[PDB]
Design a binder for this molecule. Structure first.
Ligand code: JFJ
Length: 284
């Protein structure tokens, strides 16, 4: 089945929870053996969210190459994303090592450091220009260059220096600051506005390494972001736009990381974003 009509039928039939459990049922299950090794226990924020072996990002070090991060490769859309958990106090150096080694231009952050009174990720970037961070385990320096605070999001320019070679690179930090503690946003307008800013910047384009996107577990809000981007890119591209099926795109993505889209509300929000997003692109 075009979608808006379909979205409207599910609504009157109120079957979002049913659609969603169907997706949960047919999703892929691939092994995650490296994530479960005892030497990695302190590298996983949540016991139940792990990268598959086959698609995990490997750090370039002999000691321990493990980070909780996955490469989602969308062959037809010609997009790659890295989806990862929010960094832990002991994996902040691993996080920036990955950014460096994978040649990423942008980091997308969809949570606040504290939510519902509890820490959701480490404070992994510097908050003042004159107070840089140094990650001694991986030999990296990170400096705040500028900050651009808007109503719904903040964009930061950062400088990442490899101390081993003194190469530097500009990294862009795209921080969506207004996702509610519970539920999903009422309208997708601000989230779409945020997504297009990230596109404009060049951070999603094939001349750079894959964008790194995270929330607390890296599957819920993060899944919403790459699902809405890939569906819109497929709808702009094909001969017949009505042949983009958001459930099939989601199942394809779930071959590369488990659990993408954590609730039926996130599933519904995701439809609204694509519909309204496809509405904007065509003027109507
Ligand atoms: C050239 N493609 C225009 C179009 C149609 C339907 C949806 C989108 Cl996003 C874009």
């Amino acid at each position: 089945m075009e979608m808006e009509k379909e979205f409207e039928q599910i609504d009157k039939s109120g079957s979002w929870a049913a659609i969603y459990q169907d997706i949960r049922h047919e999703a892929s299950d691939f092994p995650s053996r490296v994530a479960k090794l005892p030497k990695n226990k302190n590298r996983n924020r949540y016991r139940d969210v792990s990268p598959f072996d086959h698609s995990r990002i490997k750090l370039h070090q002999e000691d321990n190459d493990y980070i909780n991060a996955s490469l989602i490769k969308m062959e037809e859309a010609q997009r790659s994303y890295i989806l990862t958990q929010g960094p832990l106090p002991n994996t902040v150096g691993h996080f920036w090592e990955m950014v460096w080694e994978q040649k990423s231009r942008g980091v997308v952050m969809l949570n606040r450091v504290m939510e519902k009174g509890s820490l959701k990720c480490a404070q992994y970037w510097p908050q003042k220009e004159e107070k840089e961070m140094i990650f001694e385990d991986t030999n990296l320096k990170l400096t705040l260059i500028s900050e651009d605070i808007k109503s719904y999001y903040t964009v930061r320019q950062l400088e990442l220096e490899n101390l081993t070679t003194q190469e530097t690179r500009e990294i862009l930090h795209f921080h969506y600051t207004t996702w509610p503690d519970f539920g999903v946003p009422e309208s997708p307008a601000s989230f779409l506005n945020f997504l297009f800013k990230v596109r404009e910047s060049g951070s999603l384009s094939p001349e750079h390494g894959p964008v790194v996107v995270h929330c607390s577990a890296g599957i819920g809000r993060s899944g919403t972001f790459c699902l809405a981007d890939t569906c819109l890119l497929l709808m702009d591209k094909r001969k017949d736009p009505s042949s983009v099926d958001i459930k099939k795109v989601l199942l394809e993505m779930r071959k590369f990381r488990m659990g993408l889209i954590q609730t039926a509300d996130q599933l519904r929000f995701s439809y609204l974003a694509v519909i309204e997003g496809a509405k904007f692109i065509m003027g109507d």
